[PDB]
């Protein structure tokens, strides 16, 4: 019952961060193989998956510090709440370069996406220009 | 007939740039009001729209120089072809701060989009963690 209060505190911290973000305008997932479901249940396997995934999200929060620079107070609160949750599960139980490489690849995919949008519209506007100048 | 060769040269330059981009992985449009269509045709109004739009795309190419730094030779070719096309239409006939503000707003919308993707998956993984830890 104590874990319920810890996770919801993090969920509300996330809900605040995304609300602060909206006003301006391959991630871990649970699988049957992990044993966190009643069928194929493996508490030792499932607990490692929960800790591992949280450790992976803990560094994505670190790389997103510059994203929430105007509301620094909560950005650290979500990290500390995650760290406290991770420490609790680690006691209850017995790489970052790859995540930074993915996060850099994600941002090129968006910048290339903006690049194609600009160039495709340039192409499309040129087509309309030639069709118009063809008549003059 | 000379304009046809000039615009297609630019279109092929764009086709090369986007092909160089894919291997790694409010813009102007024509409207009836502009008079470039046979109905409502206004050669003086339409020619100003063609020149104006090309001038707007000419600075988006300038802000995209860092996007094509590995193939600099073609990035300058598309700009010079556009400038030659713009100069021809300007002889045939009788702000950038806003475009940079839009281009900066476009990139925040993508970074916020990545930010929400990371935080929403963090939220979703936390939900699965609580549902799993609730059973242990």
């Amino acid at each position, epitope marked *: 019952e104590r874990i319920d209060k810890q*996770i919801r505190y993090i969920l509300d911290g996330i809900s605040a961060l995304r609300k602060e973000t909206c006003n301006k305008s391959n991630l871990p997932k649970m699988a049957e193989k992990d044993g966190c*479901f*009643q*069928s194929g249940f493996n508490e030792e396997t499932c607990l490692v998956k929960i800790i591992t995934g949280l450790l992976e999200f803990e560094v994505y929060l670190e790389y997103l510090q510059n994203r929430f620079e105007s509301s620094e107070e909560q950005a650290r609160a979500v990290q500390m709440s995650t760290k406290v949750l991770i420490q609790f599960l680690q006691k209850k139980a017995k790489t970052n370069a790859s995540l930074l490489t993915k996060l850099q690849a994600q941002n090129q995919w968006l910048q290339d996406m903006t690049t194609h949008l600009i160039l495709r519209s340039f192409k499309e506007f040129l087509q309309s220009s030639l069709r118009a100048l063809r008549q003059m | 007939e000379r304009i046809d060769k000039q615009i297609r040269y630019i279109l092929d330059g764009i086709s090369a740039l986007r092909k160089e981009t894919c291997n790694k992985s409010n813009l102007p449009k024509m409207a009836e009001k502009d008079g470039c269509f046979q109905s409502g045709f206004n050669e003086e109004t339409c020619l100003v729209k063609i020149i104006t739009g090309l001038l707007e795309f000419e600075v988006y190419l300038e802000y995209l120089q860092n996007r094509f730094e590995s193939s600099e030779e073609q990035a300058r070719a598309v700009q010079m072809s556009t400038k030659v096309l713009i100069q021809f239409l300007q002889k045939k006939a009788k702000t950038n701060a806003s475009l940079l503000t839009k281009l900066q707003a476009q990139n925040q919308w993508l970074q916020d989009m990545t930010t929400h993707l990371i935080l*929403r998956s963090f939220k*979703e993984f936390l*939900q699965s963690s609580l549902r*799993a830890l*609730r059973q242990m």
Partner: antibody
Amino acid sequence: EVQLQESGPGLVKPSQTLSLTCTVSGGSITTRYYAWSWIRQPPGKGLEWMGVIDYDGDTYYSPSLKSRTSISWDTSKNQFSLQLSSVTPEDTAVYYCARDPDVVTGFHYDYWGQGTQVTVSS
Amino acid sequence: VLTQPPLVSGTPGQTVTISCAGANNDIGTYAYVSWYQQLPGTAPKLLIYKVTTRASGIPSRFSGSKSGNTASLTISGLQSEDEADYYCASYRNFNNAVFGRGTHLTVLG
């Protein structure tokens, strides 16, 4: 007391899009930790769970309906709405909006609307 | 979907059982299995949630059971007023819900 009310046209023609709106009374739709779902019932058939929207605004859809189903909301009116695309007679159903008391730890629905009937026909 | 028998029947005062066969991605995940009662012309009424927990005002004769991937609804002391359509629902990963076809409980005699 939580009350749900469905509103929408009783007739939609084939290939048109189906739009319904659920108005929530007695509670904010942005309150933790509620989820707001749409369930439909073809005549003489079973209940089909379509989608759901969080208190955060996040949407989740059935895989069968994900291509043509959209769920949005208007927090100022305390409403969430449904949009179904390219409707067919297979979409003739009574549509229900229901509340999830805690989206975090369970997908069951305690408070239901009165249901609105939509007939697909030209 | 969730497999559910078409008809179930019984005379007053006797017990009936309604089953809800599921798969590993729905009932097998977290056992978030709910049960609903629906009378004609009205919305479904939540009876049981999380397999066993009864909603407020639901009598004890309605019981929630589960074994394997199959949940069962047990209605003791059948009344003539109990004739309705009974649905089971389950959480489906991820953040999905699925209902059974439903069972019509017919009170005979």
